[PDB]
């Protein structure tokens with residue numbers, strides 16, 4: 234019995250703080266003897282404290298379509314469980330070699346040290362019986378259960394200062410050369426939502442504090458908008474509105490390349 238963990242392309246969920254990180258978790262169902270049955274089967278994941286409103290979605294058994302009464306998803310503190318019901322356990326027994334999976338998830342509140350890690354576990358047990366038994370509640374604290382590989386999603390912060398001048402407005406973009414040694418003005422895509430807001434406004438001190446932007450993750454693979462071993466990522470900052478009475482520079486003048494690592498001062502000239 235083994236558990237595998239990955240991470241969804243962060244692009245699909247959003248580069249900024251307040252976005253979800255989604256973790257696909259899967260375990261290949263064992264081949265049970267005819268008279269061996271599950272007492273229980275649970276996917277468990279205690280998510281990193283930087284992730285809030287933690288839960289699981291997309292519960293699946295490969296090659297099958299589950300119904301809503303096949304499992305129960307619950308959160309206790311940071312710990313999410315996907316616990317298969319009696320019907321679900323019968324399905325899993327009938328599906329040897331097939332992947333049992335779910336996507337664990339939480340909302341990014343902030344970067345902190347910048348390395349958000351995750352593991353998941355499979356809590357299951359079987360018993361020989363002449364007659365198929367009713368399931369049992371999985372134990373709260375099993376000793377050393379099968380545990381996945383650890384994955385890591387890396388995040389950094391950004392502090393912008395307009396000079397402080399209140400009411401200046403900015404928008405953040407994905408950079409074309411996201412992993413350049415020297416970041417460039419070249420951008421693509423729509424503005425990035427920071428806690429649901431795509432327009433950033435400097436406060437009384439002329440500051441915008443972006444508490445998290447995605448840098449890279451530990452997953453390898455073609456065309457993932459990623460660089461596995463990267464500790465810094467490029468973004469493009471665009472000034473959209475000058476503070477009251479100030480010049481908003483034309484074209485490339487209002488575009489700033491920013492290097493986010495696991496701080497930026499824009500200088501203003503008055504009319």
Ligand SMILES: [Zn+2]
Pocket residue numbers: 299300302303320321
């Ligand atoms: Zn069912």
